[PDB]
Symmetry: C3
Subunit: 125 residues, 3 copies
């Protein structure tokens, strides 16, 4: 199973990657939404995307998710830095499998990943 | 996707409705279980019910869920006000998709809603 | 629905069993992984296993899960005592449906159980 982590902070991205590797996932990191779209449109399809909602100066996570979902129906779980995130109205067009705080425990993060992976297979069926 | 919120406190119901609207859901509120049963038996079927366990002076949430589940297999997620809720023995007959604290974060609430919605399609298949 | 709880502490196992009984589950407890494997290989198949990661002096929970998964594809949710558990590299070979802290609320525990039960049916389909 391949996970793409899309996150403006390399430190946060690496912190999550290390957690995921501990459970047997191979992980790629994109530090902008544009990089993520390029990777997936270039032909590398992950089994799941962990997407920072805000991102940086470029496209935000909701835009990135909506772009990727035109390429392929892949499950997206959003990462949040705030208890109540700025979610743009466009979220209505994105299929989200979950939202998790970047400060959440390993148990909460891996559970959401594992459940999203199974829910995806059930619907993609 | 249509969500029915069944909750004795209009303030709590509206607080949850606002959160759900932010993510693109259209929401209806019933302030008694009897109102909820009337709405659904009247022919309006939600994609998911968020059900207060206690409710008020009328039927409780477990009774309401059991009544609705005779009308249609709709997913119910229970709302709780207590860390360890009074759950009547009848809970054994109700198909629950989740339990969430009314004091839970947006992330926990929306994740449970999104997962219940997908798990429902997978089983209703 | 039959749940097997595999846990080194009888006190913890009983505490979880009581919570599960409150929601209508019949529960069996194994206090070693060896006992669990004997029960399942002996012909008693649970609908779900709640598995302590560490266990005691015998086989650990990851080993127990990997052994059981050779007998039957049953959903395993791991119980953890630590915020960041010692997870052996072998976890890569185990299908996990979730991880939950033994100190977690009733709501978090029952939600994970209920969702794992439905995700299992969706995939086992
Ligand atoms: Cl990058
Ligand atoms: Cl009403
Ligand atoms: Cl035993
Ligand atoms: Na089918």
């Amino acid at each position: 199973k391949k996970i793409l982590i899309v996150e403006d902070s390399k430190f946060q991205a690496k912190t999550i990657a290390n957690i995921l590797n501990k459970y047997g996932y191979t992980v790629e990191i994109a530090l902008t939404g544009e990089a993520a779209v390029e990777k997936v449109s270039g032909g590398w399809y992950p089994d799941l995307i962990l997407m920072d909602i805000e991102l940086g100066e470029g496209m935000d996570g909701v835009q990135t998710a909506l772009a990727i979902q035109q390429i392929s129906e892949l499950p997206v779980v959003f990462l949040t830095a705030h208890t109540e995130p700025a979610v743009v109205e466009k979220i209505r067009s994105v299929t989200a499998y979950g939202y998790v705080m970047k400060s959440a425990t390993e148990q909460v993060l891996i559970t959401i990943v594992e459940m999203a992976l199974r829910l995806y297979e059930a619907n993609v069926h």
